[PDB]
Paper text:
The epidermal growth factor receptor (EGFR) is an important therapeutic target for non-small-cell lung cancers (NSCLCs). Unfortunately, in most of the cases, NSCLCs with EGFR activating mutations eventually develop resistance to these drugs, and in at least half of the relapsed cases the resistance is caused by a single secondary mutation in EGFR that leads to Thr to Met substitution at residue 790 (T790M), the gate-keeper residue. In the presented work here, we studied the binding mode of the SKLB compounds to EGFR kinase by solving their complex crystal structures. Through analysis of a panel of EGFR+SKLB complex crystal structures we identified L718, V726 and L844 as the key residues to directly interact with the N-9 substituents of SKLBs, which explained why these substituents significantly affect the inhibition potency/binding affinity of SKLBs to EGFR.
In order to covalently link to the kinase through Cys 797, a branched chemical structure was used in WZ4002, in which a phenoxyl group was attached to the C-4 position of the pyrimidine core to carry the electrophilic acrylamide and bring it in close proximity to the side-chain of Cys 797. Our previous structural studies revealed that the 4-phenoxyl moiety of WZ4002 passes through the hydrophobic clamp. Therefore, we hypothesized that the hydrophobic clamp structure should play some role in the binding of WZ4002 at least in the reversible binding stage as it does to the SKLB compounds; since a phenyl ring is not the optimal substituent for interacting with the hydrophobic clamp, the interactions between the hydrophobic clamp and WZ4002 (in the reversible binding stage) may not be the optimal. In order to test the hypothesis that the hydrophobic clamp affects the binding of WZ4002 in the reversible binding stage, we determined the crystal structure of EGFR T790M in complex with WZ4003, a reversible analogue of WZ4002. Interestingly and in agreement with our hypothesis, the 4-phenoxyl group of WZ4003 adopts a conformation obviously different from that observed in the T790M/WZ4002 complex. In the EGFR T790M/WZ4003 complex, the phenoxyl group rotates about 30 degree compared to its counterpart in the EGFR T790M/WZ4002 structure, and brings the propionamide (analogous to the acrylamide in WZ4002) farther away from the side-chain of Cys 797. This observation indicated that the 4-phenoxyl group in WZ4002/WZ4003 is not optimal for bringing the propionamide/acrylamide in proximate to Cys 797 likely due to the interaction with the hydrophobic clamp, which may also explain the observation that WZ4003 binds to EGFR T790M rather weakly. The hydrophobic clamp model can also explain the previously observed phenomenon that WZ4003 (a non-covalent analogue of WZ4002) binds to EGFR rather weakly, and explain why the newly discovered L718Q and L844V mutants are resistant to WZ4002 and CO-1686.
Residue numbers in the entry: 696 to 747, 750 to 866, 873 to 990, 994 to 1020
């Protein structure tokens, strides 16, 4: 008994969009950086195209991802522009130039400011909170999953795992980000996500260090029971770490709600220096020119517009 889903699904012709380069290869599918032009639009929008090939088993997963992505719209949640029904179904999405946050943090670990990390934490919370609002449980929150539209702006992604809160329900599951209740009982909840959220913040705070490094996955479930947990990061103040710790509490109801996380981090954002300690944050900067876009896609960019401006969803 739920409200009807009226989300609009858009079908896009292959002729309209041309792939430029490959971001990653899944063997099953690869994602290509690309430019999409609507016919008689006189606009070019940067997008990423995902290819499943044509194995029948594969398609249901491919489309399911499409069904969830189409349904949800938020600034901090990744946007699906449409799909193309070619011999192999193609998924078209807004392109984040700077890529996954997890990679980004590592590239720029020296140059990343105190303010940015706190701001990223708020952005992630907003996006997750909205999903919670939608009653959609991500089921897989990770640093790699979050993507950077710009250093200032980041959005969530990888919804294939994601399932509705109501619903009862190679072959790889990441234990480390998974909440304890989930690991023992395969239980997933928004509260479950928060635990996933805490790890993600740990990744940012630790600048992409792998969690529980050198630890067998099998071991971890036991370790959690003891109450052992990830170490406080060097940069982190107690105020920040405690917030992370609360996420990891065994009793889910106890873990901080997402809306609170936005609030707690936002206050911290006002005075970044006080909460997080890093050497010379005050004199650090990171990257918007059309010419740069030309560098990105090696093409004239006079008419280029981004999906957010163009999509104007709603
Ligand atoms: C699981 C980590 C990961 O690489 N995820 C990933 C990788 C490639 C593409 C991807 O999906 C997207 N990626 C992007 N942007 C993007 C992603 C990764 C990258 N890189 C940049 C080069 N790096 C070595 C590999 C990943 C670059 C991107 O924009 C230039 N935009 C939209 C989507 Cl849907 C996710």
């Amino acid at each position: 008994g739920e409200a009807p889903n009226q989300a609009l699904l858009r079908i896009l012709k292959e002729t309209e969009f041309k792939k430029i380069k490959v971001l990653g290869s899944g063997a099953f599918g690869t994602v290509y950086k690309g430019l999409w032009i609507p016919e008689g639009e006189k606009v070019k929008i940067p997008v990423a195209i995902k290819e499943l090939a044509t194995s029948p088993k594969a398609n249901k997963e491919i489309l399911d991802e499409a069904y969830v992505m189409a349904s949800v719209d938020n600034p901090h949640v990744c946007r699906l522009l449409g799909i193309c029904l070619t011999s192999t179904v193609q998924l078209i999405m807004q392109l984040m130039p700077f890529g996954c946050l997890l990679d980004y943090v590592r590239e720029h670990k020296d140059n990343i400011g105190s303010q940015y990390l706190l701001n990223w934490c708020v952005q992630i919370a907003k996006g997750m909170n909205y999903l919670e609002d939608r009653r959609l449980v991500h089921r897989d929150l990770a640093a790699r999953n979050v993507l950077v539209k710009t250093p200032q702006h980041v959005k969530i992604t990888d919804f294939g795992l994601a399932k509705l809160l109501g619903a009862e329900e190679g072959g790889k599951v990441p234990i480390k980000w998974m909440a304890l209740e989930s690991i023992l009982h395969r239980i997933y909840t928004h509260q479950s996500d928060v635990w996933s959220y805490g790890v993600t913040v740990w990744e940012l705070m630790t600048f992409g260090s792998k969690p529980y490094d050198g630890i067998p996955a099998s071991e971890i479930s036991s370790i959690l029971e003891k109450g052992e947990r990830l170490p406080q990061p060097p940069i982190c103040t107690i105020d920040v770490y405690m917030i992370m710790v609360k996420c990891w509490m065994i009793d889910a109801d106890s873990r901080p709600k997402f809306r609170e996380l936005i609030i707690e981090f936002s206050k911290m954002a006002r005075d970044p220096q006080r909460y997080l300690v890093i050497q010379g944050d005050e004199r650090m900067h990171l990257p918007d020119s059309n010419f740069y876009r030309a560098l990105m896609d090696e093409e004239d960019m006079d008419d280029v517009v981004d999906a957010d401006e163009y999509l104007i969803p709603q």
